[PDB]
Amino acid sequence: DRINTVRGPITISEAGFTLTHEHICGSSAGFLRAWPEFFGSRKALAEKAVRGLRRARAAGVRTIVDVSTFDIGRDVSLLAEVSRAADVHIVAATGLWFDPPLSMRLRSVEELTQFFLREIQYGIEDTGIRAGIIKVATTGKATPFQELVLKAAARASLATGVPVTTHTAASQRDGEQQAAIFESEGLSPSRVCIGHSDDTDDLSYLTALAARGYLIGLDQIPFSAIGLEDNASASALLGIRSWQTRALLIKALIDQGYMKQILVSNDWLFGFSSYVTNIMDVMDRVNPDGMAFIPLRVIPFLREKGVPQETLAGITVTNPARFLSPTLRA
Amino acid sequence: RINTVRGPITISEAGFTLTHEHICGSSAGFLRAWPEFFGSRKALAEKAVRGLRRARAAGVRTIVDVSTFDIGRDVSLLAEVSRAADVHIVAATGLWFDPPLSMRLRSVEELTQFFLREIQYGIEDTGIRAGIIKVATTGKATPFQELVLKAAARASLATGVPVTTHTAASQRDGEQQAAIFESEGLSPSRVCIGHSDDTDDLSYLTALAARGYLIGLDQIPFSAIGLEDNASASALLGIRSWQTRALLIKALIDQGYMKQILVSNDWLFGFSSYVTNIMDVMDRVNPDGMAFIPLRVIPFLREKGVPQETLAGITVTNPARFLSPTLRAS
Ligand SMILES: [Zn+2]
Ligand SMILES: [Zn+2]
Ligand SMILES: [Zn+2]
Ligand SMILES: [Zn+2]
Where are the N6-carboxylysine modifications (chain A)? Predict the structure, then answer.
């Protein structure tokens, strides 16, 4: 009956409209503290984040889930600062993404389980801030280390009730192997979001996962390099499908009967250091609305396509609350 | 003056100096996220303080902690143990073998700016300035490692701070490193070619020394003799005896290169980037820790006929000439 945020526990009712896959800053462990000038300054980054969260809040957002892991350079002290300033709840994450350092890559399943548990049950670093979600990643068939991470995430979820959310390459149908590994651990699909699922046009891939009880993360809705296709780096990151094509997958899954299984987000951020230097600016040029893109553009778009407001409130309020509220078994 | 974690020191203050050491071999952010890996931060600090006090009692006055950003260098911890043990510690900038994406994606100009920040401004928000630049290859340089070497040469050329390297001596890495450094105009007198004790190729070593390079014979206690079937320890430590490594010091002395020699242990008080208990295995191999050089190597060389004055030149005179900022130490 409580969800952990960077400001402490909140009720299901307090979470309200929740974006389930976002970032304050996509970076690397230790990088923000070592080279804040990469972002102009820590101050400038903080300011940009407060502005964006305030705009999001004005558009209706009440909570974001920051799925930045240790190796995404998650700085929960920065999260707490911006959450306070903007009055938007922020759920922090544990887990590991694609850039684990050696001190992580060398660890056993038992050790990784202890680390994820520490961040959920005790706190992150010395902040006392506890993670409310576990983030994991594969890009095609899991490496041996990625298997350890998936197993450890499942075990941490099974001991705490905190859910697991994933990065996939939806083209490579990764959710299928992620699912297989989670189920081998006894994890309920009700505690798992298969993320970046909006990157495919193969509806049958999505429906098969949904039929199994998985949550489906349609979470890069504004990602498109339409208008900048000759920007190789931007095209690689954003793809060449329109935001409308991505958004229409939400309607497609509603129509199949899977509205309760849908989670929607922007996968936005206010700083971004793990890619080409100015990728943040390019992204802002693509989507000036930032995190407010879902409420301001996507919801009205789906309404115009015939989706009732009530269904959209279900997807953006009810589903996230059911996903996040700790349980074995949602 | 030479920048230490406690402030700039004069040449006269440096005394007996171990030029390639670590307080803790880890990964960026790792110590702060998972201090229990080390028992606790307190336990790690106590172990480091005990170890430095032992080194000091054996005559050590300064160590150069060549831990980079990606070795998880925590300069706040360095300052803490430096003050507690009364041993000078020089901190490092540069990059080693585990750069995260936020480093790997950076250009030569951006890396140069980062290294310069840590030398001229300070490390993180601590105001502690680096007194050396650490770089690394394992065989032929990767494209990224080339950028790191070029950026290190540029930062050295702007500041007078020297560059020290990790090599695979068996692959004669020193020759490519030298070539890249000189293609940037760097004086060999500002460069220590490190881990040079893992070779029997005296002609490779003397050729470099003759060109003005400093030769880092810096892993003298590294040996898995008595634990050869420990795959992980033998991979890290090798099977070359400590006596063989030490006799290379005498070999270079006997060929007239005493002024080009730098000696050290490459020791540490915590180690998280390898197998979990590697620190224990290492302490079982070399209970003297950083006091191995003064307690074991020096008397061994004395017994082999090397005059004390030569050993003082190597352990006191050479490191001071190496560390004191210049563009040409001659
Ligand atoms: Zn992702
Ligand atoms: Zn993301
Ligand atoms: Zn090394
Ligand atoms: Zn080292």
Answer: 135
